[PDB]
Amino acid sequence: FAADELQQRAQGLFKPVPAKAPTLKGNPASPVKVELGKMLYFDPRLSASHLISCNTCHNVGLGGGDLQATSTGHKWQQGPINAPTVLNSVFNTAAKGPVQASVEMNNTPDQVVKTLNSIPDYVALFKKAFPGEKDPVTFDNMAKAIEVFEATLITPDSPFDQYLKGKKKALDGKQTAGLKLFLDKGCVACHGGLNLGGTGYFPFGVVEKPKGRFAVTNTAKDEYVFRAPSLRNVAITYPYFHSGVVWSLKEAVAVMGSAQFGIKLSDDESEAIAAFLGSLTGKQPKVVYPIMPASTDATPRPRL
Ligand code: HEM
Ligand code: HEM
Ligand SMILES: [Ca+2]
């Protein structure tokens, strides 16, 4: 069939989001370290101001992102960039890492550890989640708990996963079309894999110009690479591109049939393709809001 072959094909070029959180190297999972990681992820006491947590910009009930064109949350950033989703971030390859870069932006490791040492409940959770350690309340221990909570922030069973799994009836007519167009148009070169993307860097980026106020450019000439985003849950993580300038997901497909790629796109193939991309929305994780423990007289105060 022309099917059993879009489908035996895709089965090859993509893997589904696994049932369970993956293993992190150096950093075993446990109910307690996951509880701890989640407490921290939601605690705005990690910012010097007591105003920002990771959820502020990576909102688990609104697709893992912040709905904003751009923001600055990591110290390595040369200015506002669009916040990627935390959802399925663990599968990407995109004190060097996300928690540390965040903390050193809004705080110093020092005040963060003074803050955690200051609350008995947190000390006690650090001791359960990292046992047999003399001093388990460390900057590095804290990032590791958060990472193990992040690892649970995956979205199994989108219509597409249910398709690579077997079921052809998981995609509809217009999304099965869309797919073929996605492969056929080479889409899957740059945005394929376990995570449809999150994996390569390309001398390719969306730009203003000083039907298509926006389009692609070659930045080889500037030794500038951008990573090619995971496309999972993209229907829920607008606006689009590093600068968050495209709001319509149809547009964003129309900006990505660039000359620069050897790809032409019809207004109706973009359509088909946006409707394929809709299929990439998985089951949103179920998070019980953490009950974070009260500060004590010893806890540093908001700083200004
Ligand atoms: C400790 C709390 C946070 C955690 C655990 C966390 C997690 C992450 C991760 C995992 C990434 C990169 C994702 C990937 O490679 O798939 C990231 C990037 C990003 N986040 Fe956060 N995040 C936190 C706080 C924030 C905050 C508070 C903001 C505030 C405005 C923010 C805005 C952004 C931006 C703009 C990026 C991308 C930076 C770049 O690509 O250069 N994040 N975060
Ligand atoms: C028709 C096929 C393609 C489609 C539908 C497509 C779709 C998309 C979408 C929807 C985004 C925005 C995701 C977000 O903002 O989270 C994006 C960004 C991006 N993709 Fe494409 N893409 C295609 C082909 C390609 C190719 C061939 C490459 C290799 C050169 C590539 C690499 C990239 C890069 C580097 C970005 C980031 C641009 C920026 O943030 O400024 N993609 N794509
Ligand atoms: Ca976005």
Q: Where are the domains of the chain?
A: 1-19+155-283, 20-154+284-304
Q: 231 and 182 in contact (C-beta within 8 Å)? A: no
| Resolution at which this structure was determined, Å | 2.3
* CA 14/CA 281 separation, integer angstroms: 15
- Taken in order 159, 164, 167, 172, the sign of the CA dihedral is positive
Select from 249, 292, 256, 299 the least CA-distant residue to 271: 249
Distance 105 CA to ligand 2 centre (A): 28
Q: How many CB atoms lie within 10 A of CB 78?
A: 6
Cis peptide before 239 (omega within 30 of 0): yes
Q: Which residue out of 104, 223, 269, 271 is catalytically annotated?
A: 104
The CATH code of the domain at 20-154+284-304 is 1.10.760.10
Q: Could you tell me which residues come within 8 angstroms of residue 213 by beta carbon, excluding any fewer than 6 positions away?
A: none
Q: Could you tell me which residues come within 8 angstroms of residue 62 by beta carbon, excluding any fewer than 6 positions away?
A: 236
Is the CB–ligand 2 distance for residue 192 below 6 Å?
no
Distance 92 CA to ligand 1 centre (A): 13
Q: What residues form DSSP beta bridges with 215?
A: 207
As annotated, the binding site for heme c includes 54, 57-58, 74, 187, 190-191, 256
- CATH homologous superfamily for 1-19+155-283? Cytochrome c-like domain (1.10.760.10)
Is the CB–ligand 1 distance for residue 112 below 6 Å?
no
Distance 62 CA to ligand 3 centre (A): 11
Select from 45, 83, 86, 79 the least CA-distant residue to 66: 83
Is the CB–ligand 2 distance for residue 256 below 6 Å?
yes
Q: What is the 3-state secondary structure (H, E, C) of the chain?
A: CCCCCCHHHHHHHCCCCCCCCCCCCCCCCCHHHHHHHHHHHHCHHHCCCCCCCHHHHCECCCCCECCCCCECCCCCCCCCECCCCCCCHHHCCCCCCHHHHHHHHHCCHHHHHHHHHCCHHHHHHHHHHCCCCCCCCCHHHHHHHHHHHHCCCCCCCCHHHHHHCCCHHHCCHHHHHHHHHHHHCCCCCCCCCCCCCCCCEECECCECCCCCCCECCECHHHCCCEECCCCCCHHHCCCECCCCCECCHHHHHHHCCCHHHCCCCCHHHHHHHHHHHHCCCCCCCCCCCCCCCCCCCCCCCCCC
Select from 213, 165, 188 the least CA-distant residue to 276: 188
Is the CB–ligand 2 distance for residue 190 below 6 Å?
yes
Active site residue 150: no
Select from 259, 235, 261 the least CA-distant residue to 248: 235
> Phi/psi at 46 (nearest 5 deg)?
-70, -20
* CA 224/CA 217 separation, integer angstroms: 11
Question: Which among 256, 264, 266, 277 is the best mutation to test ligand 2's pocket, defined by most ligand atoms within 8 Å of the CB?
Answer: 256
> Phi/psi at 59 (nearest 5 deg)?
-85, 115
* CA 222/CA 113 separation, integer angstroms: 40
Select from 279, 271, 275 the least CA-distant residue to 162: 279
Q: 280 and 235 in contact (C-beta within 8 Å)? A: yes
